[PDB]
Structure formats: C-alpha cells, structure tokens
C-alpha cells in the first residue's frame, strides 16, 4: 500500500509527536476571498424561481400532481439564471446575488406580499426586496390564492386545533408555510451511478411494472415524473458547463481560464455520470445540495455522513495535493453558506440567523461496528477551522471506540468558539433508533438532520422539525382548569386549589397533554396530507429508499422509515415549576394552593408591590433547581418530559410512520416564552424558556459536571427525534492541554451517563457585550444558538441577551 | 284477460302535452353557480369543494313550479331542458353554440344571452375538468385505439357518472334530517387514534353541509308554492298550492306521512341527484316496493287521486333532459336519460312482490305514454299469471314498455359476482338492462362501448386498422390453417384491446375520485356513511365497471361464414376472402367474382334461426369478450363485467367497421345487443328466442339486450296474449336475461318519417329505452324499421 497525500497532514500532528494542542492550518487566499464575499453579502429576495414555477403550474393544470411537479422542476432547471461567482472551483447558484433567497409560493405566499416594504427593516433576518422584484412577485402571486399546500392543510384541521395554535399551545408553521426537507439523501448512489443511472433504474422499474391491476396507472405517472425531472437536472448542469466555458473564453488570467475550462469539463461529467475525481465528487455533492433546495424551500437538507461517502473518491484521486483536496472541501463549506431562506417575520424569529440548518457529521461507526475515522474526517474539521462560517452545522458522532485523537481534535476545534462541532452519542442514538424499528445496521449508519435529529440516511422520511410544542403552556393551562385567558382550550381537569396531592396534578397534567398532543398530531397530519395531495416531489424522491422500488413519492410513503417529530419547549421551566409545588406546598406546606393561584394570576405582584407575592416568588425562585445533580428535582424534570414524550409516541402519520418526540428550541425559546404567564418556578410572565433540555438560564450552579449529570437523568432514548443540551464555557477554563483533558473528560462522562447530545459556546461575556455595542466591527463573530451557529450580530437583541443569559461553566 | 286501460285526468293530459310540446333549451344558471362555487373554494379538499358546489346551487338555483303540477321540482326553468355541467367537460358546448339548434341528433336551443353566460363561465375551466385529468392518465396506445373506433369511454369522460338506484326508502322513512343524524353519530363514533379519521371527517362534514342545503332547496319550493297560492284566483288550485307548500316543508326534511308527501320525496331525490351531477341512468328501481307502504298507510287518499299522483311522477320523469356533444348525442339519441323503474319480482325473503302499486305503475304508463320512465317488469317462476298477462297487455300499446327481466338468470349472475343472495333478490335495473343490488352498488354500468366487430376486422388485417398498425401482428389472415389459428389470433387481439379498455375506464375512474367525489349522492348508498368514503373512493358495498360489446351477431355470423364457406365447403379461399373484404365486395369495382362471393357469404346460416352450429359460434365470440373483461379490476376494488347492449349506436359504430366475412358492406349498421342481425332471423319468434338463449347470459352480468318486433295483428285477442306470454316463459325458462318488444306496423313508422308533424306523440323502443320516433335520426329510424318483423 502506497502513500496518499490525505495522510500528509497526519504523519504530522498525529503520527509524529506533539502533545494535544496542535493548531490548525490556514486556507488559501482564494478560500478567504470566497469566505468574505458571503459575509459581506446583502441578502435579497429574488423572483425568477417563483415566477418560473408559477408558470409551470398555469401551463399544466390538467396533470396529476406528481407530473405537475416534474414540469415545475423541469421549467426551473431549464430556465433559472445560471450564476458562477468569482473564484469558485465548485459552481452552482440558487440565487443571482449571494446568500439570497428564492420565493416558493406553492407552499405559501401572502406574507411575502404583506411584507414587501417591511422586510428590509424587520428585527430578525431582514431581506431587501427591490421594487421590480416586488412587482414581478405581485404578478406571480395573483395565481396562488387557495392553490397552496398551506391553504389545503388548514381546511383539514378542526377549529379547536387552530384555536390552540392561535393561543400559543403549539404550532406547525414550519412545513405549513414552506417545504419539508429534513433529509439526508443518497449522495453516494448519485456519486457512483449519476443522474443517468437514476434514469436507468426508473426505466427498469417501468419495464417491470405489474400492469394487471389499476395500480400501475399512478405508479407509471410517478416513474415518468422522475425521468422527466432528472432529464431536466442533467440539463441544469450542462447549462453550468456551458457558462463556465463562456466565462473561460473571455477570461484574461490564464490560470483562472484553465480553472473555468476544468469546471466546464466537470459539469459535463457530473452529476449525469458517476464521479471520477475528487473535484467531480465535490461538484456532484454540491449539485445535489443546491438543486434539492431549488425544488423546495424545505431546509435541513443535511449532507449527513459526508466523510464516509466522499472518502472513496478522495482515496482514488492520488493526483491531487493535500492542500488542493482541502481547498475543494473549503469551497464546499463556503457554497453551503450561499443558501438562504426568508420566512414571515414571526417565523423568521424562530429560525433566526439566515439559517438553513444543513448538518454534516463525521466519524462514528461503520455498519459492521468498526470505527469510521478516515483522513477526510479530519479534513472536515480543518475546513470548519479554515472558513469559520455558520454553515455547515458541523457535527461529530461518538461511541465507546472513538479514538482519543479524534475527540481531542474535535474539542480543540470546539475551543475556537464557533459552536461546532456538535457532539452526538451513538451509544444512545443507535438503541433509540432500533426502538423505533430502525434495523441495527441502518441504525449504525445514522447521521444528524438539522439541529439534533438522528436518521438512517437515504432511507427515511423523517419530518424531524414538524412542530413546536410548548410544555410550559400546557402547565399554565392545567393550572387554570383548561383556559388560557378568555378561551377554553383544554378539558376541565378541576380547579388547581382543589388538588389533594401530586397525584391530582399529574392526572390533570396527563389529561391536558393527551388533549393537546392529539391536536398537535391532527395539525401535523393535516399538513402531511396536504403535501401529499398537492406537492409530491419527483426529484427529491428518487434519492431515498425505497421510492423508486415502490413507485411512490416520499410524501406518500415510499421511504423505508417514516416519522413525524414535534418539539417540546420549556422542559426545565415545567419541571422546576412542578417541583416547587411538590415541596413548597404539599411537603414544606410553606404556602397554600390558593395563594399560588392568586400569585400566578397576579404575576407575583409585578405591578402591585404585594409583598406576599414578591416574596412567595422568592420562596419558589429559591427551590431546588434541575441541573444541580439533585435527584429530587431532576426526576420531576424526567417525569414531565416523559409525559410529553409518551403521548407523542402513541400516534401515527399518513405515511405509515410513528410520531416521536424531540426536545430542542431552535431560536424560539424566547419567542414562545411570551406565550406563557407566571409559573410556579417563580418565572415571571412572558419571560424566556429553557433551551432544549438545558437547565434554566443561570440556575445550574454546581458546575458543568453537576449540570451534565442532571441532564443525563432524563429519558433521552424516548425522545428519539433528538434532544439538545447547551453549555457555555469561560475560554480560560479550557485552555492548555489540561483544558482539553478536562473537556474531553466531561463529554466522555456525559455520554457514558447516556445523554444524547451536547455542544458548547466557548466565549467571554465581554466579547458578546462588545458585539452588541459595536455590531459593524464583529460581522464575523459566529456563536452557537441551539443546534446551529449564526452571526451573533444578526440575532435580535433579546435572543442575543438570552445567549448572554446562559450559565457560564468553569472547571 | 283483456281488461283495457283507464284514462288520466285532464290535468295529467295537460301536463303530458306540456312536456311533449316543449322546446329544449340549454340553460346556464346551474353551470354559472357551480363555476362560482369552485372559484370561491379552491383551497378545500375535493369532497368539501363538491359540498360547497351543491350548496350554492341548492340555495340559489331558480325554483320554478309548473302550471297544474301536484309534484314539484324543476332542474331547468324551461320544461324538458338541460343544465350544463362544466366540471366534467365544457369545450364541446362552446364549440357548438351556433350549431346545436340545427344538429340532427337531439338539437337544443342556445339563446344568445345563454351562450354569453356560458362563455364567461367556461373561462375558468381549461385544465380543471375531470376529463382533462383522465386523459393525462391514459397511454397514447389507448388513445389511438379510441379515435380509431375500437371502443370509447366517452360516457363518463364527458359527463357525470350516474347509473345508480339510491336508497329512496331510507329518505322516505327518516328524511334528510335523518341522514344528517346518521352522519353526526358516525362522526361522534369515529375512531380518532390514527390519521385515517381526518379524511373520513372531511367526508362526514361535506355530507352534512350538502343535506342542510338540500333541506333548504325543498323549503325554497315550499316558499314558491306559498307565493303562488297568494296570487291564485282558482280556489281549488290555491288549496293545491297550499298543500304542496306544506308537503315541501315536511319532505324530504323528515319522513313522509302521506302518499302525496311520499311522491314528493321521491321526485326531490330523483331531480336533485341530476342537479348534483349530469350522470344519467338515475334509476328509480323498485318503485313499487319502497313506495307502497306510504300508499297503504294513507287511508284518506282516494284511489283515483293516488293514481293521479303516480301519473304526475311519470310526467315529471320526462322533464329531465341532457345535451351531449354532437357525436355522442347520437349514441344516446332521443333526449334520453334512461331512468329505469321496475315493478314486480320477489322479496329478499323469497316471496312474490306484486302489490296494488305494481299495477298502478302499469296504468301510469298507459295514462301518460311518454318515453320515460324506462318502465320494466321482473319475471320469475312465481310471477302470477295475471301480472305477466297485464304486462303483455301493456306491451301491446306499442310503446316498448315494459321491458322484461329474468330473476332466474340475474340473481345467479349477481351472485357469481359476489352479491349476497338477499341483496341479489332485491335487484333492480339501471339504465337500459344493467342489474344491481340497489343502494349497495357503485356499478359504472355504462362505462364504455367496445366494438367486437371492429376487433374482428383488425384480427383479419393482422392487427392493422386503416393500414395503420394498431394491434399485435397475430398473423395474416391468408395464413390460417384452420379455425383454431383464427380463434387464437382473435383472443390475442381481444386481450390487447380489452387491456386498453380497462386502462381508459380506470383513468376516468381515478379522475372522478380525485376531482369530483359526490357528498350528496354518496350518502344514499351503502356503505358510504358507515365507511366515511364517497362512491368514487369505494364506499359502496359492491363495485363494478361495465363495458358493452357491439357487433356480436355480426361477429358470430362472419366467423361461421369463414368456418363453413372457406374451410368446410371450400366455396372460396382465404385469399379470395381477403381480397373481397379489401374491395368491399366490389361495391364499386363491379367485379363479378366479389359480388357472387358476397352472395355466397350472405346466404350462410345465420344466428337467430335455432341452428346450433352457427349459434355456438355466436356464444363463443361473446364468451371471448366476456371472459377477458372478467379478468380486470378497478381502483375501487371491484370487478369489471361485460354487458351487451347498443343504446342507439349500432349504426354510429357500424360506420367504424369495414366489410365483414358475413357479407355486410363497409360502414353498415351492426346488430343491436344480442339480437340476431336485422332481418336475418327468418323462422319466426320462438326459433329466434331459442338461438339468443344459447349465449352465456350469466357471464355478461352487466346485462344483455334482446329486441323483438311483432306485427300488432299477431298479439291481438286472448290467444294473442297467450302466445305472447308463452314466448316469454319459453325464453326465460331457457335462461335468457332480457327481452323487450316493439309492437307496430311497418306503415306506421314510414308515415311517421314522411309526416313527422302528425306523429310527435309516437313513442317506440330503441334499445333498452323508448323515445319519440320522429326525434331519432333517419339512419336510426331506418335501422329500427329494418328490424325483423315477428309473427306467430
């Protein structure tokens, strides 16, 4: 076996001496220019994609939905503007201007128009809408009224489900206003066989159709839609091939001209055919990544195990230098930051930070249970250190057999303060996936979707961020006998003041949860039926088993595994609150039910000055908190979470799949706390809620190992759509080789104690405050929000302040 | 035995003539309202859109009560006119604005204003119709076969579906308001633990919204009758209107409490269905069974008033009309919507089911003598002598009605398709001859016309039609070793085109389920409410698709002609026959050899003369078609099943078939149903009946059709009725399914042709239905005139 230049930087740093602190290499000037063109780019709204898809719909009213969507994607691939940026080796642009956003009106449209003037200036994720762009979208939007997926989904929902959503119990906005996404497709298949191979599987499947029944008629419509879609897709790359050549014929720099000529050649081979060089393999990867998000605005299109399916193309390519390979990976990380997505101004504040959540993980196990580290694994950590942009949502998997090298190199990278990589624990995830019926071998191949949601890749329709659900709000409502303000949203579970024990409250809590989770499932499933009836996707579907084999889209159940995953909010908030009641009322009998009720309704006297309240606030504010290794309060948080996770688990979706709870906040634990009044934990009305399964802001006081011991007491296995735990560290506390060993020691402890995930900010309290006071000088400060990272200066100030609010850990 | 018939009131007479003098218009109010409803509701699920469609119409269509009528409810402002239903197709309407007044088959007047209104509504429709979607599902192979005249699925392609007999009795006992409570309770008992309840609860809510609109429609008729009672100077008509207004308040909202209410319930169901959708063959069915209890409980009513109410029902049935595009208007000629109503038969518990209303419905036919209802009787070994003889006595008036159906074939036939013994005993007839268990079936009983003679043509030209290759190359005709090589070639051609037939239907089937399931109709058929599914989604207990063979006797006689004149007797060679057919037997060559070959073939034994040889080839060619059809299934989980009936298109589809081995020249009419070729049954009615009964009728469980035409002289007197009924019991005891009789003199038909203005009341039997003879195109008139005249 001969030497390969992907080793040339590990015979240094890992196989040649040199204690745990090793530093990172520097990107080429080219990577630095590309990196900056993204940072300084002003995000616009563009019209070309929306108008082209609107026209495809008008011209094809009579086709079945699956063929209409093929006509949509063929018109867009054949006519969308083809843009190649200065300096890029990997080409393919969703928008003309960098880091801009298409509009997808097939899902929803009217907030875009309602917001033509206000979007340039709104608090969260503003975009610039040129006047000409507004006009063309105004003309396009005249087609859509009642013709959207959202409008259909609303008319499947009962009036009580919609009341509960109006009043902050829960929301299904994500897949209601936009596409689904949340998937890790079969990149490897396209790498080996290409779009042409996909076309050929479909010809074979079409030639073996059983035609002795009515069942062949729609399946044939699906197969023809696929073939048409990938004919347009092959065309889309040829279109880039041709513009590379046109740029090459007029380019004055000879080495840039030679690059452009090579890009043209690349786009002539891939993705239509299997890739033959690492450069092609990256171009295939990026064509898939971008084209998917042209076809639909669904985010969390996650590269997944990109170190595994790309590595064979790197090993075969002995021609290229170490640093060119690494430069190709860097351009891939920068292209990933070109994608953007606008949402209505309330949803923007929940997915804040120009974020499309495209998660990429490295390491882990093979399907045979062996460690899967390879040289590309490390090159991906290097690329993150080179580019230091919010995307990709870079990630590592960890198991008992993880090399210390890889956990130490990952910790070393985390210590840069970007929030990446996040860390996910095979030893909990694999068992959790098998419990939802994923096969052991498919389970071992898991990657992470979006923030923290695990999935057997190219095998799953996951719906991993279907809904946001406020467990704090359900507590509020349980204590007010099923009303929220002047609206009866839940059943009558007796008035609070007539509880005799904690048995009476838990039974009341279970009945409310059972009522609202059922409404959640209805709202979710109504969205599910609507995407199936009006927007099945022939392009996406071809890249997930077993769509092609079954002749059905992902939207109508062709995947092997099928899930729907709604997200709990305010878990620590709820558990601490329930515990305060349990000791400050029923055990220490230190205030009574009727004064709590009055204290809540009064908001602890935040306008009175009533000292019985401003001080039974203190009695509750100072009760034992989740996150301090105290079994009393931690097991109550375990129980409150299990109450949500065990209801969710009971339901099924129209694709033949199970609902499964996740626990993660994306950037909405501020926004959604506004929907809850004063709480028994002494939290005041409309105050933020706890991110993920993290303890409440600032109430874990016995240090990072006590906190992590608490979180691990929760049932992470049953929240198989994924849990999220944040920690923030003082940077001085992790410096040096003593820092890295403490740091890896913590992660090891937390994962052996069967938590699913953890990630870290590593930053000085004054660095964040400075970015606040002086935004124009900290454009590039990237920190971790929750399961993803963002430019801290684009976050609304109150989400900024919630990040500052978080407990600072020290060893 | 010869009892004669009573007369109707002068009111019935005036109401009859109103229909019979009525000029047919195209009206627009319904099409504009439905169009408006779709526009306002593009976001709902299909079933709810369809609920909003019928609620706009039920709440806003013009309500118009006509002079003298006792049973009220009008689809159209103008008598005997047609709504437009752009849901299904629209473009032939606009393409035909200035020619529909003057076309040969079923003309309609289109006022300028009417066409402007439809022009405005049609702008919404391009690409939104059921037909446009159904076409997108069909292979180009299947489309090519259809434009070449192998077969057509136009009926449900261009229009609604229909072809159902709804649970009339349920509405009679519990009412719309009672329908609503079944659905409320089904809703309250919905299992809501999976995702499957969501769509079921859409359906339930769509149904409820429709029946609340349906109550409003009846109450709008109560308001109109009240408005008219204000201004009525005739005080007996005023009290009539007052009582009508009371009726329409009570029914169909609640169950019926008088026979007059009961009749009103019936007509409201009958007309409202055809407001919801243009599907025809909305068949009243066993009207004498479900209506009789309301007659027996109404002790106040006089027997001549009860009869006057049934007469008005008969007359109302002739108020419905339906335009179609110029070409398919000829296949359903005669302003026909084929509302088949039957009396007699058995009960589910095996007893004969004759009751006083049975005979009142026969009287109604003799009182009114209009084309509708498509009146029918059921016969079984228990049919009382007096009922068959009374029926025959009514056949003798020369109206075509009643057509006669055989329980002893039909019940086993249905029972072979899975229908339970008790449901099969309860069967009625749909449209022309198609039997079902009522309010239990989505039957699709006229899904398609399929031309077996055209397949024969194609089989003999090695799959070619025109000279365009269109089917498999099963071998050139000249290269057949025996009849075996033919039959194998014919089977392969049959399997090829039946499979395309099945594709074409199922596409139209998928299109209807997907764009236009019906929340009003479905409520009235088991097991829709119980399952929470429309008829289009498979809610019915039983589910079929019925395509119809053309050219059976034409195909049998030709296949035998080859068998005898070519193989057995060597009167010519396969090569001479091929060349003869090619040259149309020298119809224009003058070639003496081709003209005497033609004479040889013309004179080979024919089906219809009780000759076993030629007859068993008729059975065999029919079996080849019926056995292929049996093989396929539909998207509703149901079985295809063959029919054999022509409605009015054995001429139209004759123009699609070239010369045939039996002598028929190119483009010449084909045989109607399972009847022997026109004029070719020569040994008289018993001999002909014995041939037709040799076919396999059980296999063709969508129903066979057998015409006979007698010289009136031959049925006169008590021995007339005796020979006439013996013939029937002969035919049914030999297990034929259906027979129906024209009783008319050749001159009466010729005089109708020459002086149509004097003969507008002349009503004869076309095929499975009757129509005004003078409205039929000349080539259909001539085909009916050309039929064999029987005598005893």
Coordinates of C-alpha atoms in Angstrom, one line a residue, chain B residues 155-156 163 280-281 332 338 432 434 443-449 546-548 645 647 702:
Chain B
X155 CA -70.0 8.5 -21.4
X156 CA -68.2 9.3 -18.0
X163 CA -76.1 4.7 -13.1
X280 CA -77.8 9.8 -16.4
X281 CA -79.5 6.4 -15.7
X332 CA -77.7 8.3 -26.7
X338 CA -82.7 6.3 -19.1
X432 CA -81.1 0.1 -20.2
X434 CA -78.0 -3.4 -16.2
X443 CA -71.8 -0.1 -10.8
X444 CA -70.4 2.0 -13.6
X445 CA -72.9 0.1 -15.7
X446 CA -72.3 2.1 -18.9
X447 CA -68.6 2.9 -18.7
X448 CA -67.7 2.2 -22.3
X449 CA -68.8 1.0 -25.7
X546 CA -69.4 -2.4 -17.1
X547 CA -68.3 -2.1 -20.7
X548 CA -70.6 -3.1 -23.6
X645 CA -76.4 -3.6 -25.5
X647 CA -78.0 2.1 -26.7
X702 CA -73.7 -6.1 -16.7

